[PDB]
Design a protein around this nucleic acid. Structure first.
Ligand SMILES: Nc1nc2c(ncn2[C@H]2CC[C@@H](COP(=O)(O)OP(=O)(O)OP(=O)(O)O)O2)c(=O)[nH]1
Ligand SMILES: [Ca+2]
Ligand SMILES: [Mg+2]
Ligand SMILES: [Mg+2]
Ligand SMILES: [Mg+2]
Length: 341
DNA sequence: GGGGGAAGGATT
DNA sequence: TCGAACCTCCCCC
């Protein structure tokens, strides 16, 4: 199987560049402003000029300003990036009917039936990169290998504006040499649990007792890591369908007062319903983020589709339930809809 | 013993 | 310090 993975470079910042070319060369920082104090919020993403100095996704806007006070700070315009993303995914469908759109800026293509070897795959990669640069003026990084996981790892190694092939021999080498923390799906918490069991490379999972591994990271992740270490990772490129849509907002101040939280909850429902564009959900979950950033949630599944009015009344009942069963103050409140018809 | 669904956790 | 979207206790057969 030959997999071709496409990851758009610094997507949100790059789209703003394409819409305002004078931004080119300048550190551009796309932010999510919450509405809680002057410059409260986080950096969603930044281009390379900004990342060179430490400004990256996740840090508070206030800290980014201390590092680069003269960078260009722009508010997130997700809807614009989503439209530009949908046009690039439509361009990728031309290269394969087996395509997996993993997020707004990532897609895997199974190109086994389009190329014979990695030399032909590498050329197809240049061709896709040229086609996207030509049509939308967006640079992307291409990763190629024998499965989705190594294709992504290749793209992580080659970004930005790159193209890399990790052949069978390199896959075998990485299984021995790659820090296991760089394997997709292994975040800080799992990486630390694995540094504790001694595991630091994929090959180390083959020699540890399975129940010891399973007991620490769970059955699916143990099986996943082992399958990769055995060079037996088999996951087909599958068409992905949006399974849930929702919106969670931060309130001006933390609260437990139902009538005070209500307008935020209702706005989240309004925004969520606009986004559902023709999908009718059968399940709704009210999601609260407590003052100490924990996530509490209550939901309900109906045997029928949920009308906006049923979403309004059921959400209050679910919010009341959250207030009843949890004593902490709520900071963020929202809703999530799923189980579409 | 193990489906299957609700809620919490981890990841990106 | 923001925020959108697969895996890990209990009812029930
Ligand atoms: N709002 C928000 N978005 C994030 C954060 N981290 C990443 N993102 C955005 C950037 C695009 C998208 C995909 O994220 P990935 O972590 O795969 O990173 P990436 O591909 O390097 O992102 P980019 O294209 O911006 O570099 O999610 C974050 O902390 N907050
Ligand atoms: Ca990207
Ligand atoms: Mg990405
Ligand atoms: Mg990037
Ligand atoms: Mg990691």
């Amino acid at each position: 199987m030959i997999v071709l993975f496409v990851d758009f470079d610094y997507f949100y910042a790059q789209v703003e560049e394409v819409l305002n070319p004078s931004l080119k060369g300048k550190p551009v920082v796309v932010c999510v402003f919450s509405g809680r104090f002057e410059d409260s919020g986080a950096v969603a993403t930044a281009n390379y000029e900004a990342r060179k100095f430490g400004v990256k996704a996740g840090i508070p806007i206030v800290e980014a300003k201390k590092i680069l006070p003269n960078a260009v700070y722009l508010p997130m315009r997700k809807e614009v990036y989503q439209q530009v993303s949908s046009r690039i995914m439509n361009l990728l469908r031309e290269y394969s009917e087996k395509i997996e759109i993993a997020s707004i800026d990532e897609a895997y293509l199974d190109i086994s039936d389009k190329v014979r070897d990695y030399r032909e795959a590498y050329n197809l990669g240049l061709e896709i990169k040229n086609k996207i640069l030509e049509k939308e003026k967006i640079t992307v990084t291409v990763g190629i290998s024998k499965n989705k996981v190594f294709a992504k790892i290749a793209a992580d190694m080659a970004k930005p504006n790159g193209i890399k092939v990790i052949d069978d021999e390199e896959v075998k080498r990485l299984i021995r040499e790659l820090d296991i923390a760089d394997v997709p799906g292994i975040g800080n918490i799992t990486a630390e649990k694995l540094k504790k069991l001694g595991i630091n490379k994929l090959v180390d999972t083959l020699s540890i007792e399975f129940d010891k591994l399973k007991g620490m990271i769970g059955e699916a992740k143990a099986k996943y890591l082992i399958s990769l270490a055995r060079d037996e990772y088999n996951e087909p490129i599958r068409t992905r369908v949006r399974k849930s849509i929702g919106r969670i907002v931060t309130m001006k101040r933390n609260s437990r007062n139902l009538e005070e939280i209500k307008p935020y909850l209702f706005r989240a429902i309004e925004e969520s319903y606009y986004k559902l564009d023709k999908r009718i959900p059968k399940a709704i979950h009210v999601v609260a983020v407590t003052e100490d950033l924990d996530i509490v949630s209550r939901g309900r599944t109906f045997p029928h589709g949920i009308s906006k009015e049923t979403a309004y009344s059921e959400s209050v009942k679910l919010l009341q339930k959250i207030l009843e069963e949890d004593e902490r103050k709520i900071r963020r409140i929202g809703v999530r809809f799923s189980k579409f018809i």
